Amino acid sequence: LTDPIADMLTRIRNATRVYKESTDVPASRFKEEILRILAREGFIKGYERVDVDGKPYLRVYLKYGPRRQGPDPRPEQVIHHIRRISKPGRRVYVGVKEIPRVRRGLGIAILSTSKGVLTDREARKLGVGGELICEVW
Amino acid sequence: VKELLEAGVHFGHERKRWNPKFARYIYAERNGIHIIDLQKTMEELERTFRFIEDLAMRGGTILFVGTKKQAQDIVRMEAERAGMPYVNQRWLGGMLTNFKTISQRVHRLEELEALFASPEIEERPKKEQVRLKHELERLQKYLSGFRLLKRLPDAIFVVDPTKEAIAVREARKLFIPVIALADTDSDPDLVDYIIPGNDDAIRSIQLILSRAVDLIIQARGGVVEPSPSYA
Amino acid sequence: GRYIGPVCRLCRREGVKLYLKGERCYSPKCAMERRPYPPGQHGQKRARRPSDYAVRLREKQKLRRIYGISERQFRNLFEEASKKKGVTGSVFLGLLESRLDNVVYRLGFAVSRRQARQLVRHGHITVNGRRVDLPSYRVRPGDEIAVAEKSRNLELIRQNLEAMKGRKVGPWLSLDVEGMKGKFLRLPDREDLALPVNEQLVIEFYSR
Amino acid sequence: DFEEKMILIRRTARMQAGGRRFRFGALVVVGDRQGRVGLGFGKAPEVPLAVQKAGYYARRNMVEVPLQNGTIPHEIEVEFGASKIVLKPAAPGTGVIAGAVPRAILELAGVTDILTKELGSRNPINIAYATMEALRQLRTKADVERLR
RNA sequence: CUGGUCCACCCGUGACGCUGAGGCGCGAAAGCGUGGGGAGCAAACCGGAUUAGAUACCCGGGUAGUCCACGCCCUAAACGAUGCGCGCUAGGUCUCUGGGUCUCCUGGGGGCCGAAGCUAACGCGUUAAGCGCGCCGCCUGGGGAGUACGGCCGCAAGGC
RNA sequence: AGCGCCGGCCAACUCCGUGCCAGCAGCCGCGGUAAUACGGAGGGCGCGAGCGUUACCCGGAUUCACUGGGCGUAAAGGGCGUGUAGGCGGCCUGGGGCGUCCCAUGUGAAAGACCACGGCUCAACCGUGGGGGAGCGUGGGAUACGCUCAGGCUAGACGG
Numbered sequence A: 001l002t003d004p005i006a007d008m009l010t011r012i013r014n015a016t017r018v019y020k021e022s023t024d025v026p027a028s029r030f031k032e033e034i035l036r037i038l039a040r041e042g043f044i045k046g047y048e049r050v051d052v053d054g055k056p057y058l059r060v061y062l063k064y065g066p067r068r069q070g071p072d073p074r075p076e077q078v079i080h081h082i083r084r085i086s087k088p089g090r091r092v093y094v095g096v097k098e099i100p101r102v103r104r105g106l107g108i109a110i111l112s113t114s115k116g117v118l119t120d121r122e123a124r125k126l127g128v129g130g131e132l133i134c135e136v137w
Numbered sequence B: 001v002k003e004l005l006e007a008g009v010h011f012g013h014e015r016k017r018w019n020p021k022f023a024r025y026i027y028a029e030r031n032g033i034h035i036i037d038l039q040k041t042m043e044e045l046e047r048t049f050r051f052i053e054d055l056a057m058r059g060g061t062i063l064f065v066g067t068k069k070q071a072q073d074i075v076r077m078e079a080e081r082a083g084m085p086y087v088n089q090r091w092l093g094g095m096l097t098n099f100k101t102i103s104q105r106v107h108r109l110e111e112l113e114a115l116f117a118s119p120e121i122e123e124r125p126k127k128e129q130v131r132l133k134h135e136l137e138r139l140q141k142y143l144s145g146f147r148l149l150k151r152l153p154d155a156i157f158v159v160d161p162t163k164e165a166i167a168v169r170e171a172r173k174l175f176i177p178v179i180a181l182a183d184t185d186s187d188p189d190l191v192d193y194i195i196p197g198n199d200d201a202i203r204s205i206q207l208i209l210s211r212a213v214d215l216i217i218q219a220r221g222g223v224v225e226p227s228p229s230y231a
Numbered sequence C: 001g002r003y004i005g006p007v008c009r010l011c012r013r014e015g016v017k018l019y020l021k022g023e024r025c026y027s028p029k030c031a032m033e034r035r036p037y038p039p040g041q042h043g044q045k046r047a048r049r050p051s052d053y054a055v056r057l058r059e060k061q062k063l064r065r066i067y068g069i070s071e072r073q074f075r076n077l078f079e080e081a082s083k084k085k086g087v088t089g090s091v092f093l094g095l096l097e098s099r100l101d102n103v104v105y106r107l108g109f110a111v112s113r114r115q116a117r118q119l120v121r122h123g124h125i126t127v128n129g130r131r132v133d134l135p136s137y138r139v140r141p142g143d144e145i146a147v148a149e150k151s152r153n154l155e156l157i158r159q160n161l162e163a164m165k166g167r168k169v170g171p172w173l174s175l176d177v178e179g180m181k182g183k184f185l186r187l188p189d190r191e192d193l194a195l196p197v198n199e200q201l202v203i204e205f206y207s208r
Numbered sequence D: 001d002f003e004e005k006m007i008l009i010r011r012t013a014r015m016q017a018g019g020r021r022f023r024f025g026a027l028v029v030v031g032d033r034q035g036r037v038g039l040g041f042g043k044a045p046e047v048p049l050a051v052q053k054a055g056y057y058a059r060r061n062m063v064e065v066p067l068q069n070g071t072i073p074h075e076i077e078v079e080f081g082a083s084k085i086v087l088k089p090a091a092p093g094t095g096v097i098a099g100a101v102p103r104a105i106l107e108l109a110g111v112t113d114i115l116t117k118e119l120g121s122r123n124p125i126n127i128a129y130a131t132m133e134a135l136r137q138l139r140t141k142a143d144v145e146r147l148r
Numbered sequence E: 001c002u003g004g005u006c007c008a009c010c011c012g013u014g015a016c017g018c019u020g021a022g023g024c025g026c027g028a029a030a031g032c033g034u035g036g037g038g039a040g041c042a043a044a045c046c047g048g049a050u051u052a053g054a055u056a057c058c059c060g061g062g063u064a065g066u067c068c069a070c071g072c073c074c075u076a077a078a079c080g081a082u083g084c085g086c087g088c089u090a091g092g093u094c095u096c097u098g099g100g101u102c103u104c105c106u107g108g109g110g111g112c113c114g115a116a117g118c119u120a121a122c123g124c125g126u127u128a129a130g131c132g133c134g135c136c137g138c139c140u141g142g143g144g145a146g147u148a149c150g151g152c153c154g155c156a157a158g159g160c
Numbered sequence F: 001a002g003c004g005c006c007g008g009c010c011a012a013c014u015c016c017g018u019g020c021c022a023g024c025a026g027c028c029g030c031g032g033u034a035a036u037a038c039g040g041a042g043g044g045c046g047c048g049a050g051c052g053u054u055a056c057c058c059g060g061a062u063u064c065a066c067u068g069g070g071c072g073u074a075a076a077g078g079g080c081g082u083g084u085a086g087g088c089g090g091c092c093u094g095g096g097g098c099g100u101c102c103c104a105u106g107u108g109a110a111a112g113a114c115c116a117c118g119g120c121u122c123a124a125c126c127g128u129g130g131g132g133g134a135g136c137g138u139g140g141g142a143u144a145c146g147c148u149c150a151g152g153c154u155a156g157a158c159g160g
C-alpha cells in the first residue's frame, strides 16, 4: 500500500456512495489530524480510535442529507467530492499567497504546514503555506 | 390500536432470495429462512399508522394495490370496508402516470352502466348485445375498484413492493407517498411508510390490512371493527 | 472617411427610427413613416428568422450608425471600455457620448451629428476657449463647449440655438443659451441615454 | 409568464420498403429570467407539434438556479456522457460567455454574468442536458451549512 | 529427478516491500542445420471429377514435413484483442480444491447473474472495464507501410 | 471612392446568359435548358483610402492533455517471465532541517507593459509619478509532510 492518505480519502468515498454509517481506516497520527478537520468542519460526525482484531484503527462516522422525494430517495451527500492533490508520484506545495479557494469558499483545502494540519482559511489566517493534501466539498 | 399477535401470524418467510437493503429489519435466520424483527415492525407500524390516520382525518384517499393471489380478496374486502379504491386484478401501466387516459376508460364503463338502463335502445343487433356486455364484464374485472378514484391519490398501499414494482415506480415519479407491507425480497428504501412483515401469508395480510382500515374508519367517524377474515 | 451616402436606408434596414437628419426625422415625410421595411428589391418580402449572429450584428450596426462613426474608431472605443475596470457596457456608451461632435449635437448647436461634425471640423466650435476642430476629442467633466465667437453671427447656428431656447438637454449637460455656450457636467448613464439599443448584445458580438 | 427558446430543431429519418419516413425533434428551453429553467426535448411527425410538445416537457422538468447578483455561487463541472460543461462565476460587467446551447439555458434562468466552456463532445442535446445537471447541483452557503 | 501453488498452526525474521528502461531466460505452428526415424496424414506435385473455365473446393495417388536428438529461427487472432501490485465498494447461484464445530461456515481457484458505480453504446461489475495510489509499456486521422534507408540479429527464410 | 462579398458555416436575392460546357471552390460541395453556388446586370451585405489575396506565428486544437486526454471492440498493454539502474513505499519515538513553509534584506538597469496625471487642438506618439512579481544571494524563524540518521513495532513481505 503506497498512499495511506489517498487510501483513507478513498475509503471514505466508497463508503459514502453506498450510505454506510461508519467505515474503518487503519489509524495513524497524520490521519487523525486530517479527520480532526473533517469533523470540525462537519464533513463527518466524527471518529474514535477503535481496534479490529488487535490492530489500531479509526472508525469514521459519516453524515448525509435528508431523505429525498421522487424516483431516487437517496439523500444528498455531505462530502460530494474529496480527492488527493499531492501524491507520492508528485508532491504539491503552495505558498500562502498561492493557496486556493475550494469551490469559491464553499469548500476546504486541507494542508500540512509546519504549524500542523490546517484548512485553506486557517493557513491564510496564519500566513503559512505547506503541502496541499486534498480538497473536500 | 396496534397489537402483537403478528407473532402468531407471520414473522416473515422467504429463505435467502433476500435483498441486502432489507437487512436492518431482520433479527436472525431460523431453519434456512429469514425472520423479521417484530419490534422493528412495531416501531414502523407506529410511524406508518401515524401517517395513515392523518390522511384519514383529512379526506385523503389511499389506492390499495394487491394483485398476488394471496392478497387479492383480502384487499378487495378491506378496501371496500373504507370505500377506498383498490386494484385486485392486473395493474395497468399508467394508472398514475397516464391517469387521465385510464380514467377515460371508466367513463366508458360509466356509460356502459347507463346503456343497460333499459332500453336506451337496447333494441340493437344481438351480436352487439353480448359484445358490449363482454366489454362491460371486461371493464368490470379490471376497473371495479379504480373507478372510485377520480383524481390522483394522496398515498398508496401495497402488499408486495417487489410484485407491484410498477405501481411504486409510478407513485414515486408523481411524488405520491408509498406505504407498503414488505418482507425480505423487497427494497426498503423505495417505500416511504414501511411495514416489514410477511406478504405471502393471508394471516399477515389480513392482520395488517384490516388494522389499516380499522384506523381509516375510526378516523372518519364511527369506530366499528368486526370485519370478514376467512379462517 | 465617415459615411456619406443615403441615411434613410439605414433606419429602414434597422427597423427603427434613427434620428439622423434633424427635423425631417419628425415630419410625415420621414421614410420610416412611409416605408418601414428594409431597402432594396426585397424589402417588402417576409423576413426569415434571423440568426443570433444576425441579431448581434444588427444591434451593433444600430449603435454604430447612430453616431455615424467608423467601425475602426467604434471598435477601438469598445476595446478601451473593455480593458477599463467596471461594467464595459456603461463605459462604452459613456466614451461614445464624450465625443466633441456628439456633445455639440446634444447641445443643440446642430440638428444632426453629421451637421455637428461639419461644425466642429470647420472650427466653429471651441473647448475652454481653445478652438478645437476634431470630432474625436474626448470631452471631460467640467469642460465648456461654446460657439466660436468669430462665428457667433452665423445663420444656421442662430436658428438652431433659437429652437433650443429653454429646451432641456440631458442631465449631464447645461446650456447657457443667448451666450451660445454649454458645459459637460459628467459622463452619462444608460438611464440618461435611452438608446433603442441593447448594448449587452454588442459585448456578445465582439466576444465571438 | 415563461419565456421559451428553441435551441435545436432537427429532422431524423427511418427506412423501410418505399423509402425514408421522417420525424422531427425540438430542444426547447423555458424560463422566467428569475431563477427557473426547464429543458424538454419533443419529437413528433411535424415541426410545430414537436416544438409545442417540447415546451410541455420543459415545464415538467424545471430547476431552481441559486442566482446571486446574476452569477452562479460556485464553479462547477459536469460530464453528461462524453459531453462536458464548465461554469464559472463572473463579476457584474462580464456577460454570458457561452456557446449557443448553454447560453440559451443560462440566459433564460436569469444568469447575466458567467464564464463557460464546452469540452468533449459538443453534441447540442448532450451539452444541454449537461448544463441543466450543472445548474441542478449548484449550492449556496445556506445549503452547505445546512448540511453541516 | 524437479518447479510452482493452497490450507491449517500463528512459531521465527522485523518493511527485508511494489514496479521495473536496459540485460538475461522461456517462447504454438511453420521453417532451417547435422544425424536418425517414417505407419497414418499431407504443402509442392500427378491424375479424376465439378464447372463457362476450375492452376481450387470433392475424389484417387504423393514428396518435404509431421516424430526423436542436438543446434538455430523468435513469429502469431502469442486474445480476456483487458500490464503488474495493493487497498476499498450489495448480494444470488454453480463448481474445483483445502480447513472447520461438516447443517452451515471460512480460505484459494474456475464460471454465470447482478448492488452502487462505470461506459459512445455493446457491455464491465470483489476474477472491474467501479473507487484510489505506485511503477512500466503504448496511442496521437486513413493510405503509403511494418515499406525504404541506417543499425543490430539470423545459415537462410527472415526478425527487431 | 474604392475593394471584398451575398448556397451553408457567414451578414446580404432577383433577372438574364450558359447547359457536367465555360467556370467556382477554405471545407462541405456547385454546373447535364427555371443555377439565390458559374458569367453579367439590378438590388443587398461588410468595410473605407483603403479592400482583398498569398505566406508565416499563436488561437480556436483538452488534437502532446502541467493546468487538461487516452489504450476490451474506435489509434493504443510489451507473447511471458526474471531481474539491473531508476521511480515509489507500513505503524510509533527522537535528532538533524535537505526539500517545504514564513519574516527581513540585497538584486531583479533603462525602455516596454500596467493605473494615474500631464504635453503636441485629439489621437497615434511622447513626458512625469505610482504598484509589485517570480528567480537567485544573505540573515533569522517553523517541523506537520517528504528526506536523512538513530531506536522501537508487526498489520506488508519473507521463513518455520
Ligand code: SF4
Binding pocket: C007, C008, C009, C011, C012, C017, C018, C019, C020, C021, C022, C024, C025, C026, C029, C030, C031, C032, C033
Ligand atoms: S427621416 Fe426617418 S428614416 Fe430618414 S433619417 Fe430621419 S428618422 Fe431615419
Ligand SMILES: [Mg+2]
Binding pocket: A085
Ligand atoms: Mg494537480
Ligand SMILES: [Mg+2]
Binding pocket: B014, B160, B183, B185, B199, B200
Ligand atoms: Mg413475497
Ligand SMILES: [Mg+2]
Binding pocket: C019
Ligand atoms: Mg435622439
Ligand SMILES: [Mg+2]
Binding pocket: C081, C082, C083, C084, C085, C086, C087, C088, D093
Ligand atoms: Mg471589464
Ligand SMILES: [Mg+2]
Binding pocket: C169, C170, C171, C192, C193
Ligand atoms: Mg434625457
Ligand SMILES: [Mg+2]
Binding pocket: C192, C193, C194, C195
Ligand atoms: Mg437617449
Ligand SMILES: [Mg+2]
Binding pocket: C206, C207, C208
Ligand atoms: Mg476574443
Ligand SMILES: [Mg+2]
Binding pocket: none
Ligand atoms: Mg427523455
Ligand SMILES: [Mg+2]
Binding pocket: D080, D081, D082, D083, D121, D123, D126
Ligand atoms: Mg455526450
Ligand SMILES: [Mg+2]
Binding pocket: D079, D081, D082
Ligand atoms: Mg468521458
Ligand SMILES: [Mg+2]
Binding pocket: A104, D073, D089, D090
Ligand atoms: Mg463569486
Ligand SMILES: [Mg+2]
Binding pocket: D120, D121, D122
Ligand atoms: Mg469530440
Ligand SMILES: [Mg+2]
Binding pocket: D122
Ligand atoms: Mg461537430
Ligand SMILES: [Mg+2]
Binding pocket: D064, D066, D138, D139
Ligand atoms: Mg437549490
Ligand SMILES: [Mg+2]
Binding pocket: E010, E011
Ligand atoms: Mg509470531
